[PDB]
Symmetry: C3
Subunit: 348 residues, 3 copies
Amino acid sequence: SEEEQERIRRILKEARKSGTEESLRQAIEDVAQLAKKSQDSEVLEEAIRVILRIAKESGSEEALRQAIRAVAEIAKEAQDSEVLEEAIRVILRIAKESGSEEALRQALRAVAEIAEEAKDERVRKEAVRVMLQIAKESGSKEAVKLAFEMILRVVRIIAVLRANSVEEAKEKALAVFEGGVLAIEITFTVPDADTVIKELSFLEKEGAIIGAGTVTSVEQCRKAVESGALFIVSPHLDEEISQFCDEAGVAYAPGVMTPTELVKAMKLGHRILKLFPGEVVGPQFVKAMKGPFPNVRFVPTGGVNLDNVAEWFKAGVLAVGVGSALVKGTPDEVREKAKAFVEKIKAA
Amino acid sequence: SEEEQERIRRILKEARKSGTEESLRQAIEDVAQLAKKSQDSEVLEEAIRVILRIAKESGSEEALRQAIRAVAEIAKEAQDSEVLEEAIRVILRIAKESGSEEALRQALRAVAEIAEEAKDERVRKEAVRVMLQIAKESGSKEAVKLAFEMILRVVRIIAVLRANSVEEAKEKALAVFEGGVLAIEITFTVPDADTVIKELSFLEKEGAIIGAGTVTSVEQCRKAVESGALFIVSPHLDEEISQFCDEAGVAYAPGVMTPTELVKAMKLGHRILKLFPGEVVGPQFVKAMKGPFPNVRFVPTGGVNLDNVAEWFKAGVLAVGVGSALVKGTPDEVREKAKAFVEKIKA
Amino acid sequence: SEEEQERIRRILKEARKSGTEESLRQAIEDVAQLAKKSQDSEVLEEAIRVILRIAKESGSEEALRQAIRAVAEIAKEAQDSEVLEEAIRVILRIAKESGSEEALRQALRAVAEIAEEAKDERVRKEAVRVMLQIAKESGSKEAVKLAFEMILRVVRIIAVLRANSVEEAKEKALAVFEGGVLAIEITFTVPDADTVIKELSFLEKEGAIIGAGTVTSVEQCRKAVESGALFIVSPHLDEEISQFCDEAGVAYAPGVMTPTELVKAMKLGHRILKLFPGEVVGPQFVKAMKGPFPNVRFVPTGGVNLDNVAEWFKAGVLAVGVGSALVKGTPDEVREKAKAFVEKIKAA
């Protein structure tokens, strides 16, 4: 393997000596070509970190975007999760260098695709934290919705927590974390809900996402975004709120229940919707919405349980919002329920 | 105990000779104190008469509204229903002399709370009759809404009546009233429904409340009122009907089906909503709305049947609207199904 | 027999010698009297030629409309389909001679009623073909709505086509037409639905009716009606589409799901509504709507299948919109399942 290792170095030294820009992007495809013929974990990591310096020296977005597709292909060919974690951190470095958001959208879809074919949770925890930073590093009008859509596509399950004692609530939030589902949503009905989402903001740095729900007024939503909420679930579409999330750069997934309410939600720029109550319309609703409204996905949060969640995802839902069937009870028991829901989603 | 009648008459005569309003408000507290130590039905009902005698002599709003709480507390401590019937009639007379919306609102919640703990059909009939008269006074928007809300809490079940003639509707409404159903909704599918609600006005004197359902227009609602209806029930949310019902002083329960329609109904000022069709959304909808909308209560009028009616009230529902499953058949059949629904609602 | 045929010749010759319109009006009821007493496919279909033949006194919406009820009565008592076909064509010529709005609307209900006694389907295809020409003679807003209601009253089932090419959409449309489904809705998920509607416009002269579905904008709706669409279908209620469909003389069935959406559609002048998704609310919804809204008809286009369509019509639905369960598969499969849907509706 030391022979091809030197070969990757020889391509580098000769590509730098070649002042032509075509040989620079050609060196990207040359390194990717030999990485496709390899089967070792360490070889793919050296190849990926090599493509970084080539495109950054080119200074053109055509080489940066071509590098994102190369590292994403090497990560799909690999088998060690160590290379996948470095691939995600590398894609962040490429997209951050361009910063033109044409690559940021492509980087998010690549990061979420790498986390999709992941055997352990460490890769998915790396992804969610990076996609948050990618949307944060972007800091613009879009990307937050694409991050929200992709992160939900990775975490698959979002919990609905409610407890009067913040001591008991955080005992459940960490507990549902321990199951590995991540992406916990806390209800705003809880009296000291501002504090629970601020003290649980340390989960954001470990691969989780915290948000507020049942938000009905702009004043209540302002309190959530100041406390650390990254998404506002809501019970029904609100015109005043939806304009505040777009100005504040926070994702907003309003609640709909009929196709007519769906169209009014799309008229305000919301293709990520909340199906509420989900148990009322059932999975037949999301199946019937695919035809007339493609590329539009929902997150049903109603009477979803272990018997329901199996047939919600076969209908093509983005994520599912479970509440009493997951969080209610002692913390150690909802850790086993959080593991049970993840196991049920991965199968059907 | 005859000694308590003396002591009660001593507290009145002593505080009457004083005349100071400080001692008069203390006389209500002294009479209410001895009433809590006694278990005689005649000692308690005499204390209620004296509490009224003291308050109406004081004349102040503070003393009159304190007398309402005292009479209401004596009712909660009593077992004889004749004490509760007397308390309701006294609560009416105290708020009637006082006036203002605060006393009349406090009286509406008091006589309705007494009706729940009464566990007797006679007291619930009197509560409806008094609450209608309390709402007839003042006549404010908040009075007719609160009175309609408390009345639905007491009767628990409203009958959606449909027939093929005025006489068949009159006999069905009387039959369902004998079963224990005190609230009757007359749809406009019955021919001459305005004549049916007009000739059924004698039931409102025996503890009933007749209204009009299936109201689609304002011309339809204008004929429902003036003909004697006390509440208007529509399958959807109408902006003009809610306007006409507000300025006419009549309760209005519109129909909703989705949380988006719920919020729009609250924006108009209605927190007592008709869930229609209730059989489509099911009790899962009512439990789901309790979270973000706690101060909103529903009345499902869909496929409410003896099987699911138990599950509806287990979901925190104000009242249920039944039809066909209740009002279909002979008057004898309606009377027995009326007794069956009231029995299963008691749970 | 022909002893009655000679009598009909005498009724016409003698009443024509009189010339008084009261005797020509009596000649119609005399012919319809002896036609009621006879059972002969040749005596009946000749009696209605004479009733049409007695147009010497122009009804001007008096004698002509008396002729329509007489020929519609002869067709009701008949059994031979050749008499029913001749009755429909004669009613068209009588209403075309009058030109009044009452005669044209009375002819629509007469022709549609003749097709309800079905058996041979060429009558139903001729009825739809004739009812379209009647609506184009009137051209009023009431005529387009009534003709659309009557055609759906006859065809009972609408095919909701979704394809991935113009050629597969054309082939499936021909396949569902040969199966017995005379109503075809071309969704805009098809790449070039306008050309599909345009190339399928020849079926409208054979007894079919081509329309567009899943329309969201007025630009979409204008291209559909300019391509040959005779009815516009949307998943929700669009105020601007209803405005354009009115001034363009094209039927429009909006989508409703709650009773409040029902009322908002009626106040715009729509009593033929699309219940969507029908599988979510179920036939319990349409049964409960007939109480407050007896004039509304509904066409459920949800999860309609062979097990569903039986209990949809028992609840009194006008027509049903079937897709996937009818359109998906090879063109050879969708022919035989179209025959099964038509056969299942005929029974229950």
